[PDB]
From a paper:
HIV-1 protease (HIV-1 PR) is among the best-studied enzymes in biochemistry. This 99 amino acid long homodimeric aspartic PR plays a pivotal role in the viral replication cycle. In the assembled immature particle, the PR domain of Gag-Pol cleaves Gag and Gag-Pol at nine distinct sites to create the mature, functional subunits. Proteolytic processing results in a dramatic rearrangement of the particle core termed maturation, which is a prerequisite for HIV-1 infectivity.
The degradation fragment 2 displayed only weak inhibitory activity, with a Ki value of 3.2±0.3 μM. To investigate the binding modes of compounds 1 and 2, we co-crystallized both with HIV-1 PR and determined the corresponding structures at resolutions of 1.6 Å and 1.4 Å, respectively. Both crystals were of identical space group (P61), and contained one PR dimer in the asymmetric unit. The structures were refined with two inhibitor molecules bound in alternative orientations related by 180° rotation with 50% relative occupancy. The crystal structures revealed that compounds 1 and 2 both occupy enzyme subsites S2, S1, S1′ and S2′. Interestingly, the positions and conformations of moieties common to compound 1 and 2 as well as their interactions within the S2 to S2′ subsites were quite different. The largest difference was observed in the P1 and P2′ moieties, where the extent of interactions was much lower for compound 2 compared with compound 1. This might provide a structural explanation for the observation that compound 2 displayed a low inhibitory activity against HIV-1 PR, considering that it occupies the S2 to S2′ enzyme binding subsites. In addition, compound 2 differs from compound 1 in that it has a free terminal amine group, which is charged at lower pH and likely repulsed from the enzyme cavity. In support of this hypothesis, acetylation of the free amine of compound 2 led to a major increase in inhibitory activity.
Author numbering:
A (entry chain B), B (entry chain A): 1 to 99
The structure:
């Protein structure tokens, strides 16, 4: 779909059998989700944003279905104010900016 | 232009007579720039991101030319890692997401 930006670009996702809403975020290099119990192995990681940084758990090769388009990639999980779909997954669903 | 997301969506801006590069950021409600000496009145403001928050100066009705398209709006100025063009200005240049 084509999405205008008068409101936040929130979409429904399904990940790890759970339904969530997440922001399509072209400023984010990586995907960062609120605390959830993704199964399997991981690696602690530090990421920085406006405000400073947070500690996250890095999960690789995780399936996410982002507005009905499947993608597999790294998902960081941690103390975020908002679930963020970053460019690592946006590129897999074919997302572009246009003006 | 149409912009893919394999790299950061950086564009050239001109603001306050100065040339800068900024990120087209659909996840940001507001526009936040690194410290610069925008002339005129303003109001101190707190904004939150990943990591916590920062204090900024809020400047209204500031002209910015974002990849050649003019826009006027609020610009927050403060201690950001990266210059961010948020939706307040993206909507003025007609920016959409597409997949
Ligand atoms: C993987 C990313 C999440 C990454 N850690 C991250 O925060 N990138 C941001 C750019 C950046 C990079 C390094 C250091 C500082 C800032 C851009 C994201 O697009 C972020 C998304 C966002 C996160 C939290 C709350 C609101 C937006 N944008 C954002 O800070 O615009 C600024 C705001 C405007 N109003 C409230 S904050």
């Amino acid at each position: 779909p084509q999405i205008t930006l008068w409101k936040r670009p929130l979409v429904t996702i399904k990940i790890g059998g759970q339904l969530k809403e997440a922001l399509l975020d072209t400023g984010a290099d990586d995907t960062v989700i609120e605390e959830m119990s993704l199964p399997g192995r991981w690696k602690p990681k530090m990421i920085g944003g406006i405000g400073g940084f947070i500690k996250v758990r890095q999960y690789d090769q995780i399936i996410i279905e982002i507005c009905g388009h499947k993608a597999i990639g790294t998902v960081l999980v941690g103390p975020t104010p908002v679930n963020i779909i970053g460019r690592n997954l946006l590129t897999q669903i074919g997302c572009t900016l246009n003006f």
